[PDB]
Amino acid sequence: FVVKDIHFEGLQRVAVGAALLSMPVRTGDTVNDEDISNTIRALFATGNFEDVRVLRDGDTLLVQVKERPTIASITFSGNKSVKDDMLKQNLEASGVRVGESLDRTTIADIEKGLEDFYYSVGKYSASVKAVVTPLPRNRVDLKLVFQEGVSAEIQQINIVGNHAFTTDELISHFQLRDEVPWWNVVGDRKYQKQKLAGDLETLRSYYLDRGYARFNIDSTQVSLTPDKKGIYVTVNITEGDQYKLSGVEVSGNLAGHSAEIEQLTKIEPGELYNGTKVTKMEDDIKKLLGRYGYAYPRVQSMPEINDADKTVKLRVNVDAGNRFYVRKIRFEGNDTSKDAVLRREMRQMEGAWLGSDLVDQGKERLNRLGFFETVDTDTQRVPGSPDQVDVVYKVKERNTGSFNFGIGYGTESGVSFQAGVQQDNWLGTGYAVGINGTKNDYQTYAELSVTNPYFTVDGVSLGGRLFYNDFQADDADLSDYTNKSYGTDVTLGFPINEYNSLRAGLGYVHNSLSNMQPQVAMWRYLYSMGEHPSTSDQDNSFKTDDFTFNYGWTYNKLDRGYFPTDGSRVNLTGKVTIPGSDNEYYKVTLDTATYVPIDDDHKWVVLGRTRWGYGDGLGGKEMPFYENFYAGGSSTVRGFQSNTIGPKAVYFPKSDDAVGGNAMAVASLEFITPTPFISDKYANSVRTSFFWDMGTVWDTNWDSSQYSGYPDYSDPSNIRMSAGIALQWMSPLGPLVFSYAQPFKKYDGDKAEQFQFNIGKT
């Protein structure tokens, strides 16, 4: 047979010219059944068709073919466990995408791919089906239906071979969890291989930190329950004896700093081996070699062990490397935030010698802002220069605007509500604005604030606020009056060190008082101000306007933000009225908290707290009665009802109502011990303590000589005391703390409240 022509049928989409180019045979060629078979198998090999059929017609080589149907629609059903976009990402494999061509023969591959995907999610019993429907013009649509099954969970975590420690102590630090109480927050019983590897390396570190130089992990097995609901984890370990440290030595390309490195490497004899100390020593060697301008200092250490003496000798090798210089720093991805907003956070200077630790800590500084989802870094050698590089940062922004709401309860103030909206990166400028409000039983508050974190390039900040307040005293168990106020402040921040900073600013406040119940302590102040209200009536009012100068200082070296075990925190604040205002007074406060561990494991610690306050008028006038100090309650002295400590009211026509005083002193001492009866797997999440409290409040201006029939409220000798027990943990509803204490030294007007608690943020 000779090709007079080639005739096509069914080529509705695939080009006839493309097929004519694609066959191994052309017009005029001698053809047999072998060439016909080659043509049809080649057309099958093209992949555009599902059913190729060919024939030897009278005057042409006939090809009649149905092309592969084109998929025009993808739909899902029953997939609610996993996101539709996640399904779309998963189906990117195997050429399953809209607009392309496929066949029904590959459905099982999709089935098994989806099954494997949900197995990787942990849905070991999931099942999937597909339904396929064709359409004219050789179009086709498909739908996918999903059954999620049941997600497996970890049943037990077991360690065999340990003898030095109990298994619960080792389990307690792992990411995976086998027991989760309903009243605590410790995690979830999901299984992930990355978390398993992290737990394995944490277990290795836990033994390397205590002198077990010969520690090794033999094998690990993961087992599945026959119903495929539970997962079992078991690790095999073996540990030898503890080893002592005999000494260290260092050699290599030290580049002349050998004595300075050697003075850093010395360790006293008799200490146990410690991998954390070894790593810290080598990191300090890298840092010290890095401040001399080397870009990539490389160090390495291997331990030499002697099994006869149970001693380890440490060998360290150091390679200085070379010097590079930074030619340019570029940012990309910041399509909204200003360039300077990112460039401010860097620690590497452009046009200076490179520092790798500086680049990493600049990445961390940029990541701490929270404006970006992810941060990446790359160092690229500029072409044609042996020793110049460019540093490039990759960022992806996120929406910083949010609105938040909260609720809590406690004996101190009852039900509390919180609500507000905030925007941290206004127009990509770095400014922060927000509006906030709060309501308690006895107080209602609202404010609006604006803050510029960089008023000066060194970190000096500038901000202000505008507020409104509404305080009603009788609902707080005080003497009856009502105070509504508004004003505005402006303040500066000035950091001078990593741990402490200064503060200063100005402010204005306007006060309005009403419904004042007549009493001698209040009307002393009114007479001092020069007003003579009517003793028999309750319907008096008073107005004042003041300008104040504020300052402060804070010191904070605490070990960690939650459940600290070491450090101290001190805060001092002041206030004074500049001339031209109505009142003339000053006030100063100071409080202190410090932790002193008594155990090497930092599970037995001692806590001590204090609080002081003082204030008086400048001349002639007195401090207003609404600026007084208060004591008692869960915040100040446990065991006493809120605001009950101090002087008491004396009406004009004595009672348990407290009025507070213009001087205060409070002290406390507390012992923290491990919880006795919680299982060790999560015993560290609950803190239990015993305390001893004391404090007093007195009014320095009380003229005792004219009021012999009443106690002396100017005497600071009336010290109150109490002692008890308290405990706290993180509830699913939020932070939670309980207390029970009994006062063993009280006076006539003090009302006790033995059981106190608080739930959530208040």
Partner: protein, 353 residues
């Protein structure tokens, strides 16, 4: 999904003879702990400890002892008894998850010897000519001399990346042991030193593990999860006939017929002479069943909902149904010397007429 309970009329009314609780049960932990009977006394155990001996007839306690350590701030740690209870001679052998193997004398429960093995002992121990064989979680097979408790010989077996919880208890015939494996393989070892005689692959996620095997009249029968039932010669790993069945539960052979429970919880019958089915009883599907036993001319199978089903083997039809305990039944029943006993997922032990 799980099928609802069937409706039947009972040709006889089984009743509880006596019941005695033994501490807590195995809980929700999957384990192999089950009671054992010999010489008209019954031994049971708890996961925390508390090995207890009870007389067969009255069910009253004879002696009790606890293996847990009892020192602390008013707290104690469990011993995690997962290995099954078997008795031979005057000793009682129980395994533990802490890699301990305990031997308690029958007279008073005092420990005779205690030996630490290479891993978690999960299979029920078997006793043969002074040696006890234990299949550990990490794939090691060890033999301990029953007199002193010392290790005799050890054989190492491969372990896949993922497997089913549980291990295959070996069986012994003609001085050589036969044991399954987690890699879908059956191996035979000589008893004295541990020389490997022959090995064969039975199976086709990719999980494929084995139960205990059984040997009769010179041929070896084996079964593998999601795999193939097979018949093997004792001389070598030659294969006669094969079918597409798989189960993690035990199976029983009698006369010329084989009874088993499918992993899909389907009861079936097969012939020894060839792989052909006699009848199929498929209505308890996806209810978590247990391995079957033969008692009083009937086939008795527990249910995880706490029901006990009686099946007639002549045609595969229900004959009875009973509710026993609300806790459920996971472990296998045991029947010997005219008695039938079972332990719930709770510590209660039942004696059934």
């Amino acid at each position: 999904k799980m099928s609802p309970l069937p409706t039947v009329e009972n040709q006889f009314t089984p009743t509880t003879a006596w019941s005695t609780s033994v501490g807590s049960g195995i809980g929700n932990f999957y384990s192999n702990l089950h009671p054992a009977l010999a010489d008209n006394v019954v031994y049971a155990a708890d996961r925390a400890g508390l090995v207890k001996a009870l007389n067969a007839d009255d069910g009253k306690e004879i002696w009790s002892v606890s293996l847990a350590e009892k020192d602390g701030w008013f707290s104690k740690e469990p011993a995690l008894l997962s290995g099954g209870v078997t008795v031979s001679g005057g000793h009682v052998y129980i395994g533990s998850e802490k890699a301990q193997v305990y031997a308690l004398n029958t007279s008073d429960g005092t420990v005779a010897w205690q030996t630490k093995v290479a891993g978690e002992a999960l299979s029920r121990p078997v006793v043969s000519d002074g040696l006890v064989l234990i299949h550990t979680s990490n794939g090691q097979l060890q033999a301990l001399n029953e007199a002193d408790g010392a290790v005799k010989w050890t054989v190492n077996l491969d372990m896949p990346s993922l497997s089913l919880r549980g291990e295959s208890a070996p069986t012994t015939a003609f001085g050589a042991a036969v044991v399954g494996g987690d890699n879908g393989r059956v191996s035979a070892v000589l008893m004295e030193q541990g020389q490997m005689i022959w090995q064969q692959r039975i199976s086709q996620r990719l999980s494929d593990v084995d139960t205990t095997p059984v040997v009769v009249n010179g041929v070896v029968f084996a079964l593998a999860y999601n795999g193939n039932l097979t018949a093997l010669d004792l001389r070598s790993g030659q294969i006669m006939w094969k079918r597409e069945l798989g189960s993690v539960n035990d199976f029983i052979v009698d006369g010329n017929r084989i009874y088993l429970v499918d992993q899909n919880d389907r009861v079936m019958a097969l012939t020894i002479d060839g792989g052909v089915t006699l009848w199929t009883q498929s209505d308890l599907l996806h209810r978590l069943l247990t391995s079957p036993v033969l008692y009083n001319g009937n086939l008795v199978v527990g249910d995880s909902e706490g029901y006990l089903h009686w099946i007639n083997v002549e045609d595969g039809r229900f004959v009875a149904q009973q509710k026993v305990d609300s806790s459920g039944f996971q472990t296998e029943p045991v029947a010997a010397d005219g008695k039938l006993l079972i332990q719930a997922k709770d510590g209660t032990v039942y004696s059934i007429t």
